[PDB]
Amino acid sequence: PVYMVYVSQDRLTPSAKHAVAKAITDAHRGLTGTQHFLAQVNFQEQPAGNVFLGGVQQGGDTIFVHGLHREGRSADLKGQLAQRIVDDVSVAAEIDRKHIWVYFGEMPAQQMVDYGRFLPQPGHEGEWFDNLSSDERAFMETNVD
Amino acid sequence: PVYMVYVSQDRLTPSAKHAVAKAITDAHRGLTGTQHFLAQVNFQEQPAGNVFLGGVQQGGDTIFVHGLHREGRSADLKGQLAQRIVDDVSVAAEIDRKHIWVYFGEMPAQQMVDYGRFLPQPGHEGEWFDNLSSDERAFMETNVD
Amino acid sequence: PVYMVYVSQDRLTPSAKHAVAKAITDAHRGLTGTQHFLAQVNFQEQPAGNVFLGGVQQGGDTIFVHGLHREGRSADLKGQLAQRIVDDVSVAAEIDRKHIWVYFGEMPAQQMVDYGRFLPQPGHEGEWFDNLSSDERAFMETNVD
Incomplete structure (x- = not known):
């Protein structure tokens, strides 16, 4: 996956970012069985005041997670994952759930x-990783915590 | 909905931002009957020079709106909304129409x-919102402009 | 199409950004027949350390290319196009392929x-361009490099 995490500048310290990425990654591997190193978490910070809710300028406490997934998973599995991401990001970022938006877009694996x-x-x-070249697998394997 | 609005830094003043978000929110509500507080407008600012049309680096005079919607509306209605977003953003941001791009993606509501x-x-x-907890109805209700 | 390119601050000099933007534009134009002026490359810079893979904080080397296309192209052409974006962005940005992620999303032309x-x-x-006014045609013809 690629999770685009849209947050306000400095709402997540370097270390808070690590735990938010940890929670998103662990939720993905735990529910889909995809290797940790296939989960990309990409923080997009912006100055406070660039988020508007119903036309009202907002502070620095909103979080939008835009997930980009392969097609093929069920609406049930996708709902569990969206609920776990709301849950775990809440605890990692110490933010109320009312602040968290989570959207999953899906694309064919053949164009990803x-x-x-x-x-x-x-x-x-499983098979797909074993097919990768030897220093391909190695480079991927260096990205697990 | 979530509207990702990609603009060059300093192009939009804080009130110009207020006008664009308000022009996008009003369009979506006036055409979908979706409550004001459900319309998030997320300004993603980048230094000018980061946008390339046809390989040619641009100044600050391009806006790109990426709208993320539920599935289930007609192509006819989506055309109207996007055309409204183009026109009302032209006015609100004082930019010629030929510089606005507007894309809509849709997902199942069950993963949103x-x-x-x-x-x-x-x-x-109106019925989903009446069933939500009143702590939250209250929280959203403050996001009306 | 709109190509969202996520990179770390100061990874790409202006010349390198122009070259990345050019590699993506001529890959698209090349394999689709879409005019040079119709391709937008939108660069999104974030501080190094904002990308996490498997929960591991990255340097400035990841590059995520999110392409937004209209529907109707074949899975074969899209793979060819992504593989060429990989290859020519590797070369233009002097970065190896295993740092490059490339996703394509598709939408009905009628909501774009x-x-x-x-x-x-x-x-x-071609019919579409031969249907635009003179001001439009001449103002898109300005965006060819």
């Missing part, structure tokens, strides 16, 4: 590239 | 969390 | 607006 490689179908990550 | 809550199907929003 | 105008199907581009 991670680490310069095309992704397999959901659940086939 | 606003305010920590999954969304109803389009048109059922 | 370039230069203030709705786009046609992919199999109607």
Whole structure:
């Protein structure tokens, strides 16, 4: 996956960012069975005042998570994952759930590239990693915490 | 909805931002019947020179709106809304129409969390909101402009 | 199309940004027949350390390319296009392929607006340009490099 996490400038310290990325990644691997290192968390910070809710300028406490996934998972599984991300990001970022928005977009695996490689179908990550070249797998493996 | 609005830094004053967010929110509500507080407008500012049309670096005079919606509206209605967003943003931001791009993506409502809550199907929003907890109805109700 | 390119601050000099933006524009133009002026590259810079892979904080080397296309192109052409974006962004940005992620999202042309105008199907581009006014045509012809 690629999770675009849209937050206000400095609402998450370097270390808060690490735990938010940790929670998003662990929720993904735990619920989909995809390797930790396939989860990309991409923080987009902006100055406070760039978020408007119903036309009202907002402070620095809103969080939008835009997830980009492969097609192939069920509406049930996707709802569990969206609810776990709301839950865990809440505890990692110490933010009320009322502040958290989470959208999942889906694309065919055949038009999705991670680490310069095309992704397999959901659940086939096992064989697909074994097929990767030896220093491809190595580079991916250096991104697990 | 979530409207990602991509503009160059310093292009939009704090009130010009207020006008654009208000022009986008009013369009969406006036055409979908979705409550004001459900319209998030998320200004993503970048230094001018970061936008390339046809390989040619641009100044600060381009706006790109990316709207994220539930599925279930007609192509006819989506055309009207996007055309309204183009026109009303032209006025609100004092920019010629030929510089605005507007894209809409749609997802199943079952994988779309606003305010920590999954969304109803389009048109059922008065009843979904009446059933939410009153702590939260109250929280959203302050986001009306 | 709109190509959202997420990079870390100061990874790309102006010359390198121009070259990345050019590699993406001519890959698209090349494999689709879409005019040079119709391709937007939108650069999104974030401080180094804002990208996490498997919860591991990254340097300035990741690059995420999010392409927003209209529907109707074949899975074969989209893969070719992503693979070429990988290859030519690797070269233009002097960064190896395993740092490059490339996703394509698709939308009905009828909810997509370039230069203030709705786009046609992919199999109607030349007709579409020969249907715009003189001011439009001449103002898009300014965006060729």
